[PDB]
Amino acid sequence: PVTINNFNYNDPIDNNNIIMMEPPFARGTGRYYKAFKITDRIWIIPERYTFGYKPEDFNKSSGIFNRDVCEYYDPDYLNTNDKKNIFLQTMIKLFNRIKSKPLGEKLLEMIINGIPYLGDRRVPLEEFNTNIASVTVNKLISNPGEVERKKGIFANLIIFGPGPVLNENETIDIGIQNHFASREGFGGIMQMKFCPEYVSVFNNVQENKGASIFNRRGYFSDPALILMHELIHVLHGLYGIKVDDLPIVPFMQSTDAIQAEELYTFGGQDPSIITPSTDKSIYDKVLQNFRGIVDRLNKVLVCISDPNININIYKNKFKDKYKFVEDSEGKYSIDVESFDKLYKSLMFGFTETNIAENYKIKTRASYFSDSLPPVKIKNLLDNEIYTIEEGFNISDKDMEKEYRGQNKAINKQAYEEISKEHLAVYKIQMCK
Ligand SMILES: [Zn+2]
Numbered sequence: 001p002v003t004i005n006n007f008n009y010n011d012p013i014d015n016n017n018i019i020m021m022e023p024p025f026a027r028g029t030g031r032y033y034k035a036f037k038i039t040d041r042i043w044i045i046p047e048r049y050t051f052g053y054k055p056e057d058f059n060k061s062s063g064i065f066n067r068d069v070c071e072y073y074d075p076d077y078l079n080t081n082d083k084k085n086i087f088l089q090t091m092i093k094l095f096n097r098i099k100s101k102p103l104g105e106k107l108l109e110m111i112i113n114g115i116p117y118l119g120d121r122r123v124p125l126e127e128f129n130t131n132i133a134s135v136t137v138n139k140l141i142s143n144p145g146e147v148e149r150k151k152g153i154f155a156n157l158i159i160f161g162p163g164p165v166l167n168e169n170e171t172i173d174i175g176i177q178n179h180f181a182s183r184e185g186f187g188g189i190m191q192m193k194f195c196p197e198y199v200s201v202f203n204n205v206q207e208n209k210g211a212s213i214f215n216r217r218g219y220f221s222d223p224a225l226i227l228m229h230e231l232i233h234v235l236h237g238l239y240g241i242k243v244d245d246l247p248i249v250p251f252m253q254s255t256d257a258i259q260a261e262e263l264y265t266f267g268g269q270d271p272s273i274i275t276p277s278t279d280k281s282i283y284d285k286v287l288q289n290f291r292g293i294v295d296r297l298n299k300v301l302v303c304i305s306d307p308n309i310n311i312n313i314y315k316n317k318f319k320d321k322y323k324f325v326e327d328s329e330g331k332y333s334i335d336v337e338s339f340d341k342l343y344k345s346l347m348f349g350f351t352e353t354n355i356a357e358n359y360k361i362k363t364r365a366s367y368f369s370d371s372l373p374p375v376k377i378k379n380l381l382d383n384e385i386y387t388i389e390e391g392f393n394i395s396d397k398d399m400e401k402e403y404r405g406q407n408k409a410i411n412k413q414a415y416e417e418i419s420k421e422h423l424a425v426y427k428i429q430m431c432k
Helices: 081-098 102-113 223-238 260-266 276-299 311-322 336-349 352-358 420-430
Strands: 018-022 033-039 042-045 136-140 150-154 157-160 170-172 190-193 375-377
Touching: 033 081, 042 081, 042 102, 081 102, 081 223, 102 223, 102 352, 170 223, 190 223, 223 260, 223 336, 223 352, 260 352, 276 311, 276 336
Parallel strands: 042 157, 157 190
Antiparallel strands: 018 033, 018 136, 033 042, 136 150, 170 190
């Protein structure tokens, strides 16, 4: 069972749930940020994602005429201790919403149990190595005003605040010399840029299909589903199955090329436009990568960075993670049936579509959908607007039927239009 911890931003450092941790991309460079353990292996650093970005990238465009309504900027987001607390409490509420039903509970469990392999492709077949950015992150164990002393701890996911564009949530993996452990069967510490308030809007759905122009319905997204979408990428990245650069050329609304990774993650009727050949090659690549992991497990003898780590305990943890089988002599191998079940679970089981169906959340029909302007949700921490159990679609307020709590024309008090330009663009899109 998954426990979702509680803390406030101003709560003191305890070297358990609240620490100073050095993120993966900042490894070796003694910069530590206040990190909060929301569940085992999952941390939240309520700061803006600045990796590979300059401070000027965070600024808004020079004026209204050159603004892009599809891309929202605000350099003042997360600038105070109180804004960093609002972020943490919103994340705890969203995580509590994810575990409120069986599907999301298992998603969090699969993420937690999906520990990165103790190594990558550079590591010898006979060794486990924890001294890399994709397996461990440094924790500051010394008090302020003392010479910095560290300890490497295991982690699976680190969620940060947004990068320059607030409404563009993204899950990132670690690359070493254009090779990602998260795409090679190993798995690796995943990172995310997340923003709960600025959500996506759509009008693609099963309705509107032939319906009158005035009777066209436009809805806003639930921040929990948006988070669950990104957590599926984390899952693929933790099990070493993230599909690398593979664009797919095409109900549906857009004909534009999209990544294979994004299609499987969205799910529903999306994996159907993928040629049976491409679909089979993605499956075969995962098998070949898992075959590499099993060969390593059969050859691993020592842990180079941690000669204390018990080889048998970790081999067993990896046997459970990848659902490998063992013979009478201890030798591991792949069982096609258990592999098929795990594969179908990671790629087709945990999708945005059936998470949306199970949670009564409204989402778009296809990923091949038009980008509508984002909207800002004023307060997610108010139960009169948003709940852990039901979302925006609250039963008492008659928002549970026809997903009316997500309908922009109906639940006008749950959100606010970012600008007059955003509304003007939305009105043209709703009535083409
Ligand atoms: Zn995505």
